[PDB]
Ligand binder design. Sequence first.
Ligand SMILES: CCCCCCCCCCCCCCCCCC(=O)OC[C@H](COP(=O)([O-])OCC(O)COP(=O)([O-])OC[C@@H](COC(=O)CCCCCCCCCCCCCCCCC)OC(=O)CCCCCCCCCCCCCCCCC)OC(=O)CCCCCCCCCCCCCCCCC
Ligand SMILES: CCCCCCCCCCCCCCCCCC(=O)OC[C@H](COP(=O)([O-])OCC(O)COP(=O)([O-])OC[C@@H](COC(=O)CCCCCCCCCCCCCCCCC)OC(=O)CCCCCCCCCCCCCCCCC)OC(=O)CCCCCCCCCCCCCCCCC
Ligand SMILES: CCCCCCCCCCCCCCCCCC(=O)OC[C@H](COP(=O)([O-])OCC(O)COP(=O)([O-])OC[C@@H](COC(=O)CCCCCCCCCCCCCCCCC)OC(=O)CCCCCCCCCCCCCCCCC)OC(=O)CCCCCCCCCCCCCCCCC
Ligand SMILES: CCCCCCCCCCCCCCCCCC(=O)OC[C@H](COP(=O)([O-])OCC(O)COP(=O)([O-])OC[C@@H](COC(=O)CCCCCCCCCCCCCCCCC)OC(=O)CCCCCCCCCCCCCCCCC)OC(=O)CCCCCCCCCCCCCCCCC
Ligand SMILES: CCCCCCCC/C=C/CCCCCCCC(=O)OC[C@H](COP(=O)(O)OCCN)OC(=O)CCCCCCC/C=C/CCCCCCCC
Ligand SMILES: CCCCCCCC/C=C/CCCCCCCC(=O)OC[C@H](COP(=O)(O)OCCN)OC(=O)CCCCCCC/C=C/CCCCCCCC
Ligand SMILES: CCCCCCCC/C=C\CCCCCCCC(=O)OC[C@H](COP(=O)(O)OCCN)OC(=O)CCCCCCC/C=C/CCCCCCCC
Ligand SMILES: CCCCCCCCCCCCCCCC(=O)OC[C@H](COP(=O)(O)O)OC(=O)CCCCCCCCCCCCCCC
Ligand SMILES: [Zn+2]
Lengths: 230, 141, 61, 152, 75, 73, 141, 226
Amino acid sequence: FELNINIINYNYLGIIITVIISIYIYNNSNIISVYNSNLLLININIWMKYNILDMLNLNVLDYKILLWIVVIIISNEILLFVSFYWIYYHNYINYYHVNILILNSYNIVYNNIILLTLLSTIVNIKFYNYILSYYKYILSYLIYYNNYMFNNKIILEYKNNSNYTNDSVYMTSYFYIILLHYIHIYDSIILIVVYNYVNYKNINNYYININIYYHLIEVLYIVISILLYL
Amino acid sequence: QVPDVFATFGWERRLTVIHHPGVMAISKLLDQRTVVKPRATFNQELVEEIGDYDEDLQRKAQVALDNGLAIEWRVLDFIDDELPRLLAEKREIEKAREQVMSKAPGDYTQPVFDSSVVVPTPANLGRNYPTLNLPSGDPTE
Amino acid sequence: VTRYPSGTRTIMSPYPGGPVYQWLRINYNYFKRYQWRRVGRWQMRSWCYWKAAFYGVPEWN
Amino acid sequence: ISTSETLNQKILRWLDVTGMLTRWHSRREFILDMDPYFRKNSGMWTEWERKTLLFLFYCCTLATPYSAYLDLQELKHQGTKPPRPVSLESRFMNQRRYDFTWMHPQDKFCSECRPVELECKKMCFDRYRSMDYRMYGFQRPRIQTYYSFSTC
Amino acid sequence: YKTENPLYKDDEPFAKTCHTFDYTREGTEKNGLGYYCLMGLWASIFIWDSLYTGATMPTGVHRYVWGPYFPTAWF
Amino acid sequence: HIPHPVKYVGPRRYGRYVYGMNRPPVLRQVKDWIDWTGWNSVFGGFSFQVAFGLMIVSGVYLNNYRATHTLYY
Amino acid sequence: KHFFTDGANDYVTGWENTPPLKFPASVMKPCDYSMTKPIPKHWKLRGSGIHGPENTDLMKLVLWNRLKQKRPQREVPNINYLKDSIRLELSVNWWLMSCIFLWGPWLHWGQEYQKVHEQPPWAMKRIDGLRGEGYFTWFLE
Amino acid sequence: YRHWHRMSEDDWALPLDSMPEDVKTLMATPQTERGFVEDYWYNRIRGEATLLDPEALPSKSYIALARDMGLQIVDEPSSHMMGLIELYEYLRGASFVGPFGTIENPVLVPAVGQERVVACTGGVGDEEHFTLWFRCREGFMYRCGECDQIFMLVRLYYEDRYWTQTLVRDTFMSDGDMFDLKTLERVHKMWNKDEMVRWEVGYWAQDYVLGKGVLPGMVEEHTRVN
Ligand SMILES: CCCCCCCCCCCCCCCCCC(=O)OC[C@H](COP(=O)([O-])OCC(O)COP(=O)([O-])OC[C@@H](COC(=O)CCCCCCCCCCCCCCCCC)OC(=O)CCCCCCCCCCCCCCCCC)OC(=O)CCCCCCCCCCCCCCCCC
Ligand SMILES: CCCCCCCCCCCCCCCCCC(=O)OC[C@H](COP(=O)([O-])OCC(O)COP(=O)([O-])OC[C@@H](COC(=O)CCCCCCCCCCCCCCCCC)OC(=O)CCCCCCCCCCCCCCCCC)OC(=O)CCCCCCCCCCCCCCCCC
Ligand SMILES: CCCCCCCCCCCCCCCCCC(=O)OC[C@H](COP(=O)([O-])OCC(O)COP(=O)([O-])OC[C@@H](COC(=O)CCCCCCCCCCCCCCCCC)OC(=O)CCCCCCCCCCCCCCCCC)OC(=O)CCCCCCCCCCCCCCCCC
Ligand SMILES: CCCCCCCCCCCCCCCCCC(=O)OC[C@H](COP(=O)([O-])OCC(O)COP(=O)([O-])OC[C@@H](COC(=O)CCCCCCCCCCCCCCCCC)OC(=O)CCCCCCCCCCCCCCCCC)OC(=O)CCCCCCCCCCCCCCCCC
Ligand SMILES: CCCCCCCC/C=C/CCCCCCCC(=O)OC[C@H](COP(=O)(O)OCCN)OC(=O)CCCCCCC/C=C/CCCCCCCC
Ligand SMILES: CCCCCCCC/C=C/CCCCCCCC(=O)OC[C@H](COP(=O)(O)OCCN)OC(=O)CCCCCCC/C=C/CCCCCCCC
Ligand SMILES: CCCCCCCC/C=C\CCCCCCCC(=O)OC[C@H](COP(=O)(O)OCCN)OC(=O)CCCCCCC/C=C/CCCCCCCC
Ligand SMILES: CCCCCCCCCCCCCCCC(=O)OC[C@H](COP(=O)(O)O)OC(=O)CCCCCCCCCCCCCCC
Ligand SMILES: [Zn+2]
């Protein structure tokens, strides 16, 4: 027989990661922060390596445990956006009569909605192929093109906007809510860059996580679009 | 008298049950995929549906149906050449089934038949069929 | 029934097509299968994130 | 022109120049278009799954050009955004407790300019250049550079 | 022999055991007529509010053929 | 989940494609495809845009035309 | 379905609480001995009596759940199951179609009208002398 | 069991490359001296040699047939040990529910060691009480202080070892007549002739007996690039 769980006795990434966090506080140059971020990325990858190596234990509950962890993380991301919506709507009584130019409801909203919908369709096709034990090379490069356009559009919008964060709480909330969504789009790039075909298929937690996360980002933008643009 | 046996499954995680020794012998025999072969029997309706996906197989499948042949798919690709042997094989198998079934209980003598036309058997182990997955037509025509 | 090389002959029309059409059909088929898919095969095999996780781990006996 | 085919057949043929329609109507053509490693699993697919997958795939790819057209128009719109009236500094507008330095904690470039206030930075970079300190940007006319989306 | 195409076969039933799953009496499988009535009312209220702006500020003059305590007056 | 039969009642096979001969009209083919893949996805997908579009475009009459003809001052 | 559930959508291990309905009750049956008749007093307990593999039905359930994992062909589900598996995918695709072919046309029309008349076609024209497009979603005014 | 993961490819069969190259010694090794891989191929080579000889099967007794395939004849001792193994494995990830324990029929608590923690929850319905945990050690008839339910520890122990499927086989299975390599050759020629190899394990096994790389195509079969 064997123990139900193969215990993990020792770990040293925790110390390294925690020290990396402290380096952000104790920096005397923003250049150190940039290089420190690479270290954090490296060590987080090692932690992800340990999760993949745990497959050797053949434990049925490992998939379930990680899936429910992601559910909790998703909830935290939703509640973080709720706080920004809370901040935005608290000062609702002070909006729409101040001498600032709010965003148009015709151009930005439509193309972004169309663009992000295509992103969902690409990920949906990836899920379908994952169900069918099949792969299509071009799909990943469609995501990169999709992400390239999103970055190009958002950069221009910020640069050409004629109002600034210090003009009103409305502008601050607009910029902040849009940035928060962008950061979650960038986190999606971090995840999707490693998409590959793995032959153990439906016992791979990465596929279900990516599908859930991409759907969350897109639905959040619908709420943002209704609140700010429409 | 048939003794009961332990049957185990799995390599590292092993599950054991009691089973019939004869059933296990049949089970392992059917695992000899090169010896014991699945064979297909068609009906007219199914043959017609095949044409929707492979016109050549429909014609070859129709020949098998018209002669009431239980045929392996690999052999079906060569039914034009194998037909005379397949008809002979069908008769010999039927003869063997009749003899063994009709024999009195306790009589386990081998049936009398021409094994040279039955494949796979020690007398005839089959032909080395070449692959037919090559194109013959010129795209520009 | 004549079997043509995969992806080279259309089934939509009895006419194979004109010289330009045939060139486009044949060369896209080649570019996809033997040029573009190099990149995909290279990323899938030589740069697999999950393979890199087991690098240096002993073989499973 | 070719009279060996109907008009519908001719239209379908050209729409099939990349083989999309042929792969849709032939299971054999579709599976052989897969790479050998994945062709191993093709036998398990139902026709409902196969054609449904192509439908989702074709709708996505066919819609990509439309999104590209929208994005190009968006880039052109931003490339020639009309100027807007200068904001009157109202009661609660442009309030500052400290200079803007979170981007450059040590260098403190353009402390008076906001993080993405390009015109303010341009004039600030010019001062630094006039003080013999190089700075990158805001020097090339927009119509003389590529990818500006501002050309006539 | 005769066969049935698997694609068009019916769904398999839940097994009948001590632990039997049954959704037949729940009435949660699909939206019912009540849901579509709520949608109809929402459309009606949306149209009505826009068409007749003075509906929320009704007239106070009361004229009843059979007085105010007659049922038709109440509605 | 309530077990229930497959509601598709259209043709199950058109036959082998032979240069597009002996095949139904295009509109009938579109109807068959949606029957095969389910109308529930069509209604659900289009429901949101139809509701939003009708509400916005109804204002052309409800908000613009009626208001001009109905202003007691 | 996308999400994994131990009870119903258990694709990680493929465990099923009950056997397929195909098998006759004699071959295999659901593990239910709630209806067992009272045990005669003269019978003596030989086994543990503990719920587990000593019961025939549970042993067969465990055996089948391991040996079902290899099958010669696919067990084709009906179209209802296949629809449900990609319900979200199909609906998102139709939502994209609706955005392109329904939202796009009237949004383009509104902007063109706005150009000529200073306000969207679904808005009351102002008489207060303020310039600009004004609101878009009229019913939220 | 429900707590096991998916069957691996090896759970069905092993690759031929795992066949021991010294087949002559493999077929002469006693069962107690064969490892997991050696035992697997001994049974498969000997089992398939008898099954691929149809003319001899009808005259072969079930005892001999079971021996050739490596199947263990069940008896009360072996059945008892195997049954308690499966019960222990099942309880790893399953609930522990059964009849109320009494002196005549104590609750059986399988264990490998000398101790295992157990809880008593009383009888059914109203007789059920709060969990009362205790350490069930070997050699004592435990009595719950609340409901008076009787528990007993059963140890899966045998001669300085704990019961396992292999241990049961070694203890009770008896090696029969030594396998004759002539049978391997005779069956090999029956199903392998003129480039047709329908008995591939025997083809490899016969090649190893003749050394290695003697039969046609075996040199090319054994040459690898990495
Ligand atoms: C006489 C010729 C007439 C030609 C007319 C023009 C036709 C152009 C079609 C371009 C379609 C691009 C679609 C992009 C989305 C991704 C597609 C995809 O999934 O590809 C998979 C495909 C194979 O992927 P895989 O993983 O191996 O296989 C996956 C599947 O299993 C198997 O995949 P699959 O085989 O099912 O793929 C189906 C299909 C799925 O996608 C579609 O079917 C979408 C179709 C959309 C049509 C868009 C047309 C745009 C035209 C606009 C013109 C505007 C003019 C304005 C004028 C203004 C005047 C004032 O994908 C493709 O076929 C993609 C195109 C393949 C070409 C690759 C070679 C390089 C480019 C060659 C271009 C040649 C143009 C010649 C023009 C001549 C004119 C006389 O990917 C590749 O081949 C590799 C990457 C390259 C693909 C994209 C190439 C873009 C080329 C654009 C050309 C048009 C530019 C117009 C500019 C106008 C400026 C004003
Ligand atoms: C912003 C403005 C608007 C922009 C819109 C942009 C739209 C982009 C759409 C792109 C669509 C791509 C379509 C690809 C079609 C491929 C088939 C084809 O044509 O193959 C022919 C042929 C095939 O030969 P083959 O395969 O050997 O066939 C021999 C067989 O034996 C015989 O076999 P066969 O008979 O089957 O082969 C021949 C057959 C092949 O074709 C077919 O039968 C077609 C069947 C499939 C059709 C499926 C649909 C295709 C997509 C339609 C897209 C519609 C776009 C609508 C845009 C509206 C914009 C308002 O028939 C044809 O060749 C007919 C071609 C019809 C072309 C129609 C062009 C319409 C242009 C409209 C312009 C409007 C401008 C308005 C300005 C307003 C200003 C206020 O080879 C080529 O494709 C030739 C390539 C070389 C072309 C050279 C062009 C030189 C142009 C010089 C311009 C100089 C300008 C100077 C200016 C100076 C100023 C001062
Ligand atoms: C007006 C126009 C504009 C509208 C804008 C709308 C904006 C919406 C924003 C949404 C953002 C995106 C979020 C979802 C992203 C993923 C989408 C996705 O993949 O969907 C397809 C996919 C469909 O799944 P499937 O298995 O294929 O289903 C097939 C069929 O649909 C049939 O499936 P089935 O019915 O057979 O069931 C299987 C499936 C069915 O489930 C789903 O499919 C879920 C679909 C959800 C879609 C989102 C709809 C909106 C939900 C609103 C919930 C509000 C909560 C209450 C807030 C109170 C505030 C005061 O089950 C699961 O997948 C289980 C998932 C785990 C659920 C964990 C829930 C934890 C929280 C429980 C409540 C806590 C409060 C208790 C209070 C009482 C205390 C006594 O969904 C998933 O698989 C997603 C599951 C993973 C993400 C779960 C996230 C849970 C977050 C919990 C937050 C709790 C906060 C509590 C405190 C709050 C107050 C302080
Ligand atoms: C004499 C005077 C005469 C006067 C005459 C006047 C005439 C007036 C006519 C008025 C007519 C009124 C009619 C009322 C009755 C309606 C009856 C009806 O059919 O109701 C039900 C009908 C449909 O409901 P249903 O029957 O339940 O739907 C059936 C489904 O198939 C159920 O099946 P299912 O559940 O399987 O459905 C599929 C489902 C299956 O689910 C799954 O597969 C499982 C997973 C579900 C959870 C998903 C989680 C998240 C997924 C992530 C992926 C996201 C992708 C997109 C990403 C975008 C990124 C940007 O999945 C989905 O549907 C969701 C996924 C698809 C994509 C979702 C996209 C985002 C949605 C959320 C945002 C929505 C807002 C967007 C706004 C724009 C953009 C910002 O409801 C409506 O249509 C709503 C009623 C609207 C009433 C409006 C009334 C006002 C307007 C009046 C206009 C006319 C006035 C003109 C002036 C007149 C003056 C006199
Ligand atoms: C500031 C805001 C936040 C951003 C800053 C960094 C935050 C870093 C926090 C990261 C938390 C990660 C939690 C992960 C939990 C889920 C893990 C999981 O399921 O992984 C396994 C899953 C599947 O593996 P299998 O072997 O198939 O199965 C596993 C065993 N059954 O694998 C994956 O998810 C693959 C992930 C690959 C991509 C990894 C990329 C890591 C990115 C780290 C970002 C760090 C950026 C730091 C920036 C600092 C300066 C701003
Ligand atoms: C015997 C009876 C025959 C009757 C025939 C009736 C034929 C009716 C044909 C109606 C055609 C209507 C076409 C409308 C197209 C409008 C396209 C348009 O506006 O494109 C722009 C817009 C994007 O522009 P942006 O600048 O980005 O602005 C919006 C976002 N910022 O793009 C789109 O709208 C793309 C979507 C195209 C929609 C096409 C609609 C086609 C409708 C055809 C109907 C045919 C009916 C036939 C009935 C037959 C009865 C026998
Ligand atoms: C190889 C190089 C690759 C580079 C490109 C690819 C990687 C990109 C990585 C993601 C980048 C995401 C950037 C997010 C921050 C964006 C900042 C921004 O735009 O801020 C301005 C925008 C609007 O401002 P205005 O200029 O007034 O707008 C008027 C319009 N004309 O919003 C703001 O001002 C808010 C700024 C919030 C910034 C938050 C970012 C985190 C900064 C942390 C600094 C901490 C320093 C202290 C020490 C600790 C170090 C960890
Ligand atoms: C945490 C915040 C969440 C967001 C805020 C939610 C607030 C509201 C939530 C309500 C519940 C939503 C789900 C409803 C589901 C549903 O439709 O549920 C549908 C059900 C019927 O169920 P079935 O049809 O499925 O059997 O409908 C009902 O039970 C009630 C609605 C039917 C119509 C009611 C009519 C009201 C009449 C009012 C007066 C009109 C006067 C007209 C004069 C001419
Ligand atoms: Zn007790």
